[PDB]
Ligand binder design. Structure first.
Ligand code: COA
Ligand code: COA
Lengths: 662, 662
């Protein structure tokens, strides 16, 4: 095979990110064997130098001439850094005089945390490295490819980023899932604008057999790594649930934490004065050991104990607690009165291996082709797809026929709930976060106040002017139930302040503060990489930042809104709204599954203010007013306290992680 | 070196149907150049020998050896002749000792009629040639491939068979669209069973630039062919519409037909004897001429006149017409008093060109890559895709980035309508067609009688026992409004009989008479091609045969039901149900668009009794009875008199062509 494809890509120039190892290294190799010129770029110079050296030796053996000039490298290329990526483009053009293929292969695993534990810096890094980087490179290379009359951009997404019309939950990996869904969503929504010269496709392999998946150089396998992650999160969630259950029935949080601080399972189960939830917690922990590990004798490690106090703090559970209300956040690891010894594992290796085989067996059992593709198999597929000249706007699936069955599909709304469900809002507080969507914010506030008899709507805006514009659309009697909170630092701080001032909300509606830009690849005024980064911040990160507080609130429902497009607009805003709809759906689906594993059990659903077909968008005022009213009905449908469809498996499923378009 | 891509397919054996010309011919050539062995099969020896000679000549020129033996042919292989297909498998095994790739490429254009004008034989011819032929070959080659441990089956579908989760209307081509959708639906639903050994994928190009599309030797181009067909259907629909509107006002059908028989636009314009509808029709036809063609002087050709009286008859509008009901059907073309002269064209060449330019310009404008792919481009893509070993169950799109925007996604029910709307059923007649789905048929009859106050439910069954079983589930007071009609010849005759006896239905629910088989590719007891043909007859053709009558009934709503799977079943019945759901959705979407062009304006919607996710299927008695109740609610939602497009453009579109799963 590898010596007999010299004609497939002869003379084509490829820039491949993350080209030192894995799929990227194999694509670099096979493109060179197929007669292409390759600029391989990566962070690590040693891996890159060895990989290129091996390719050049193979090129010599199959009798290429001038092999050194055919494969070039650029090290210390960090995809999270724009200057560093620009150097990769400049190096490719300096070496080869053009770029034919851009392979957006580089990726990071990301935070590997539940959303409620995930840092904003970790989320931002995953989105910058995996998704914004790809737009940065497209921005710089697309004009070169259009000017020469041809090009190919390929995004290396993942099967776990979902597929068109069908989101997939990726618990503990929401930042990664969003970044991968985003790579694909760019192909679906932007290929129109890269044509006619540039083909723009994605690949979405699932698990891929090679050194990184198997584990090499004394490193655990990716199934083993998720197994360990799963047990840590099960212990955190279990300790957290016991603390919350105790606080709900009126145990002081200071008393719960003083009892957990003793961090002794045998003493905790036996002690009579410990709350039943802590006794039962400690009993269950004491049964989980193997004779080596320590998680049967200690409830908590410093790291899990830090994650626990963070969740309690962010739920507002320290607001009236003398000590904790004021303790430095820097000290969240340091409150245990004894900690597991460092000479022994916390977690049992047997349960790690068992969870890893649940993970591996689960994916391996859903492969139509019976075995995981290797990195070479996925690289071979990639090099074959790159030779096609007729496909654009598609995601190829070189996954081994991976089929994970799920019903998380975007729905058009035409349905309603009983007034009895709405009556449960009477006397409650709701938060609406927004700025630019005045008609939608106003009608939703009116529906909650006038139709559902909510006592207080807290409208959390970017500016006082944004508050006044919504208030000006309400009757005076309705407006007396509208409270203003203008963001002063960040949305999480504004949410902490709203909770402190007016209490626990029953419904949170998250809308973007800013309208989408009306531009993408136009030569006159394109959407710059910094502008695209802000679109991601305002339309994805924003919802994450709201969600990571909202998911900690008992009896609260969370509603995420994707973008609107002004009536009559004919710009790429409509493509950008559909990009966000797809990418945010990965988040919604993932968060809905995580939240069911938390004691707070917060439902999350998504409402879309843009339809899939631009001719079906509202085109006159009657259709606009129809959409505004439908939007408020959709918010009440997924925002009102969820019905007793705990009886029905079917109905329970259709109020968590839905994406509904109005 | 320049041209060497042998590593892709060296020694792989392909059987290619329609292998002498078009895409099939180019796939045979490129597989051979890539080191493959090919058995090219088609009807004409002469065309096969030219294709084979050209390939053999080119191989020789690229320096291949033993080249005669690498490229073989079999003539008289016709996809409508299943014995000739078996002969093609045998010839491949005789020549090469094995089969690696099956390329299901041969196909026919089909009836090129609106559903209400299409014959059952023409429909059956299309489905047998384009869909059942593919299953026939799959049935014979799959065991060979599984035994050797590897294989690839590639179905050549069409963009206009839709894509996963998104159906597409192909007006005038419902037979073809269903066949193409079926080729893709087999890949989506059956790949699991062809694995792990066999990859099973489709391609779905749209228009392909070559001899067939352009036209050769005085044969019209495909765009020109659709243009003429559009003018013929617009003339038939306009004459039909005027006739129906006159009959609705109470003009006797015999009087309308006596006036139309005169077939003189200028006299019909002016004569005060004529109904206003015929005067307006004649005036409109009179204005459409070009000084050469005759359709401005005659309303009808014999062929259009035959299609007109067939529609009136099938609507039951001759039941009380003495001359017309008795006329033999063979004289449907003989009733005009004058006919256009045979030396001059009926249709104007210029309007055919204008329509052809609307058709061609439409799809060309939706290509992201700007240019229609050539036959060579699509074959090259196919040969690249066939080298991949990681993809199964997917449809590749080598279409030039063809993007036709539509909102036809399969939806899962959580929607409702006003009791006022259900109340318009009061006093009306409903038809329920079915046999095996007793619980669903009973609850739907009960819902129509008890909840909507329908006067009469005509339950059209295969057997008396099928009726008795539904009747036995009803309270005696509800059962008073249930009428039996047992099919004695065909469903069309039973519908004619129900119409004659009990009058025009407001709602027609079509359900399949037979349960799906519980088998597919099992070595012990596979689904034979003849059994698969009966699945098609019972689950696709059955609905077509109901629809071609129902689509002619004023103020009627048509509901098509796709298959159920018995609770606890773990057979490929589930895969077969999902195959039918996808394939029938092509029919539903296409017929909804055609029917809006007809004067009867009959809405068509589809209800699915099987879910996409097998673990979501009802798993106890309680979930069964919830699904049964939800089914009847879904039939009422799409079966009761619908919301006017004038009230809402958004709502109007939801209730035409939908596929809803309960
Ligand atoms: C498909 C998949 C995403 C589903 O994730 P999931 O729903 O979390 O299920 P997992 O297999 O991870 O879950 C194993 C167990 O851990 C639990 N679990 C996982 N995350 C948890 C959390 N944060 N808190 C509590 N329990 C958790 C699950 O609930 C399940 O518990 P159960 O067996 O006791 O019911 C997951 O199995 C997976 O990661 N598969 C491999 C993906 C892959 O191959 N990707 C390669 C590209 S990056
Ligand atoms: C895309 C497509 C399927 C849409 O079909 P469509 O909705 O019937 O639209 P068409 O372009 O055929 O319609 C042209 C006109 O004829 C009308 N028309 C078509 N069939 C009709 C019928 N049976 N009765 C009445 N009017 C009809 C349309 O409504 C339209 O009228 P308008 O300009 O007044 O709106 C069609 O345009 C088409 O065949 N395109 C080419 C597909 C192709 O490339 N094929 C590849 C090989 S399979």
């Amino acid at each position: 095979f590898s010596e007999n494809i010299t004609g497939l890509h002869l003379g084509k120039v490829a820039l491949i990110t993350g080209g030192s190892a894995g799929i990227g290294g194999q694509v670099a190799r096979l493109l060179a064997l197929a007669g292409g010129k390759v600029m391989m770029v990566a962070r690590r110079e040693s891996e890159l130098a060895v990989a290129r050296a091996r390719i050049v030796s193979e090129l010599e053996d199959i009798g290429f001439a001038g092999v050194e000039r055919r494969v070039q490298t650029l090290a210390n290329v960090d995809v999270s850094n724009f200057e560093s990526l620009k150097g990769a483009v400049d190096a490719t053009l300096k070496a080869f005089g053009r770029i034919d293929y851009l392979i957006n292969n580089a990726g990071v695993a990301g935070a590997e945390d539940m959303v409620v534990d995930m840092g904003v810096d970790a989320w931002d890094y995953t989105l910058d490295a995996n998704l914004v980087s790809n737009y940065f490179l497209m921005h710089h290379v697309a004009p070169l490819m259009k000017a020469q009359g041809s090009g190919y951009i390929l995004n290396v997404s993942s099967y776990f980023g979902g597929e068109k019309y069908l989101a997939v939950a990726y618990p503990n990996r929401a930042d990664y899932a969003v970044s991968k869904a985003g790579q694909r969503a760019m192909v679906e929504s932007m290929a129109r604008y890269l044509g006619p010269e540039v083909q723009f496709n994605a690949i979405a392999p699932g698990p891929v057999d090679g050194d990184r998946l198997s584990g090499t150089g004394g490193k655990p396998g990716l199934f083993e790594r998720r197994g360990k992650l799963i047990l840590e999160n099960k212990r955190l969630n279990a300790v957290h649930a016991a603390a919350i259950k105790a606080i709900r029935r009126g145990v002081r949080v200071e008393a719960v934490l003083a009892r957990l601080a003793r961090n002794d399972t045998v003493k905790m189960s036996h002690d009579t004065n410990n709350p039943r939830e802590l006794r039962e917690l400690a009993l269950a922990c004491a049964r989980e050991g193997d004779g080596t590990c320590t998680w049967d004798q200690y409830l908590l490690t410093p790291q899990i104990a830090a994650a626990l106090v963070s969740r309690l703090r962010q739920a507002g559970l320290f607001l009236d607690a003398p000590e904790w209300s004021e303790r430095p956040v820097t000290e969240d690891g340091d409150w245990l009165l004894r900690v597991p010894p460092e000479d022994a594992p916390f977690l049992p290796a047997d349960k790690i291996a068992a969870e890893a085989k649940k993970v591996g067996g689960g994916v391996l059992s859903k492969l139509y082709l019976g075995k995981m593709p290797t990195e070479h198999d996925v690289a071979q597929a990639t090099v074959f797809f790159l030779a096609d000249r007729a496909v654009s706007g598609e995601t190829f699936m070189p996954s081994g026929g991976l089929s994970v069955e799920r019903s998380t599909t975007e729905r058009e709304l035409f349905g309603s709930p009983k007034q009895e469900r709405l009556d449960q809002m009477r006397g409650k507080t709701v938060w609406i976060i927004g700025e630019h969507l005045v008609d939608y914010l106003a009608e939703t506030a009116r529906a909650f106040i006038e139709d559902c008899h909510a006592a207080n709507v807290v409208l959390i805006t970017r500016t006082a002017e944004g508050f006044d514009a919504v208030e000006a659309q309400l009757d005076e009697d309705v407006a007396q139930s509208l409270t203003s909170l203008v963001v002063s630092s960040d949305i999480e701080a504004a949410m902490d302040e709203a909770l402190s001032q007016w209490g626990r909300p029953t419904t949170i509606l998250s809308t973007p503060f800013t309208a989408l830009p009306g531009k993408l690849f136009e030569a006159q005024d394109p959407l710059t990489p910094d502008e695209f980064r802000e679109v991601v911040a305002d339309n994805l990160t924003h919802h994450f930042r709201v969600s990571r507080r909202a998911s900690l609130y008992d009896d609260c429902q969370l509603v995420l809104t994707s973008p609107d497009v002004a009536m009559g607009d004919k710009s790429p805003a409509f493509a950008l709204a559909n990009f966000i709809k797809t990418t945010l759906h990965a988040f919604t689906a993932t968060l809905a599954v995580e939240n069911e594993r938390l004691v707070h059990d917060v439902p999350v659903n998504q409402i879309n203010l843009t339809r899939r077909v631009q001719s079906e968008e509202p085109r006159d005022l009657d259709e606009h007013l129809e959409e505004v009213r439908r939007f408020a009905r959709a918010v009440l449908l997924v925002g009102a306290p969820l019905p007793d469809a705990e009886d029905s498996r079917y109905r329970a499923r259709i109020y968590r992680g839905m994406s509904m378009t109005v």
